């Protein structure tokens, strides 16, 4: 509904992004980082994924996974009741333009390896190989959708029940959704 | 990747990514899909006031699932070995839409659905009358599979020792994706 949206995607930043390629669904998996306004989406892809060829001029969507998993009905009080699944998602909208200007390019891997590496890490600077190799973008936002199915339809004991059996099981995706819930 | 990989990893993370053409915008809906035994099909589910379905019915669609995904960092490395990248499993299937609409098909689909994801304990059953009602609330359907593509990242282009300290570096951590990726890793 508001600014929790702007959180999944930084927290889930490996998205999944679809476009029409040649009139059929194409869907490439990989990092896409808000830029400091949170106005656009950065990322790249292998110039050899053909999708960027006709990536401009269409609104594409990219989709940040949240937690999900499995919500089972011998968990309430009753035989009656239904299963069902709980996630969170954010779905992004908007158009793409690429980037090939080398100090954009430079800039928007910077911000990236930042984000990724481990805070004692060395890393961080063949590399024109690494201009030949990738075709940097980015996605100019034009709509965002939020989803979380979280229970909150049900009564709140009916959901500490739910909460009380996720938490103790060994899973992240039961646990990440068992911190959702309570907050 | 090579069939009967692909389906497992369908099997395995079944809660996927349905993506249509609705009303000229690319549409999502994360829902699970199953294979049925023959796995010439996968099933799955809406609830009816998604508008998802009403257009869904005469297009190519687009399934995805996704197996473990993470990042390997270059400093596992040394310099000039590689590049910042990711590494993940996700298998895309593309198909036609088909509604199913007999209650019997329907009931049908929804007992294999919890047959799935219950625990083996399980004691749950098809025990209510509320069946009716939750039903007249969805849109089952089936996609006719068509092709399956499998979509792997698992730095296989470095030697032994790059890929055999990636693998303790992953295992060492203390994250689902890490480790599963380690596995795979093999």
């Given at each position: 509904?508001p600014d929790?949206?702007?959180?999944?995607?930084?927290?889930?930043?490996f998205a999944?992004?679809?476009?029409?390629?040649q009139?059929?669904?194409?869907?490439?998996?990989?990092?896409?980082?808000?830029?400091r306004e949170?106005?656009?989406?950065?990322?790249?892809?292998?110039?050899?994924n053909?999708?960027w060829?006709?990536?401009?001029?269409?609104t594409v969507?990219?989709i940040?996974?949240?937690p999900?998993?499995?919500?089972?009905?011998?968990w309430?009080?009753?035989?009656?009741?239904?299963?069902?699944?709980?996630?969170?998602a954010?779905?992004?909208?908007?158009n793409?333009?690429?980037?090939n200007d080398?100090?954009?390019?430079?800039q928007?891997?910077?911000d990236?390896?930042?984000?990724?590496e481990?805070?004692g890490?060395?890393?961080?600077?063949?590399?024109?190989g690494?201009?030949?190799?990738?075709?940097?973008?980015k996605?100019i936002?034009?709509?965002?959708?939020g989803?979380?199915?979280?229970?909150?339809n049900?009564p709140?004991?009916?959901?500490?029940?739910?909460?009380?059996?996720?938490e103790?099981?060994?899973?992240?995706?039961?646990?990440?959704?068992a911190?959702?819930?309570?907050?």
């Open positions: 509904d929790v949206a702007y959180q999944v995607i930084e927290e889930n930043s999944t992004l679809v476009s029409m390629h009139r059929e669904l194409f869907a490439t998996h990989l990092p896409l980082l808000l830029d949170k106005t656009c989406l950065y990322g790249h892809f292998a110039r050899s053909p999708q060829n006709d990536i401009q001029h269409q969507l990219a940040f996974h949240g999900h998993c499995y919500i089972s009905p011998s309430y009080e009753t035989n009656q009741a239904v299963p069902t699944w709980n996630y969170v954010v779905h992004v909208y908007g793409v333009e690429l980037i080398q100090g954009e390019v430079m928007s891997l910077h990236m390896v930042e984000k990724y481990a805070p890490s060395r890393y961080q600077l063949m590399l024109s690494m201009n030949k190799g990738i075709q940097a973008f996605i936002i034009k709509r965002i959708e989803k979380a199915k979280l229970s909150q049900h709140a004991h009916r959901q500490e029940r739910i909460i009380k059996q996720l103790q099981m060994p899973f992240e995706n039961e646990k990440r959704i911190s959702l819930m309570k907050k």
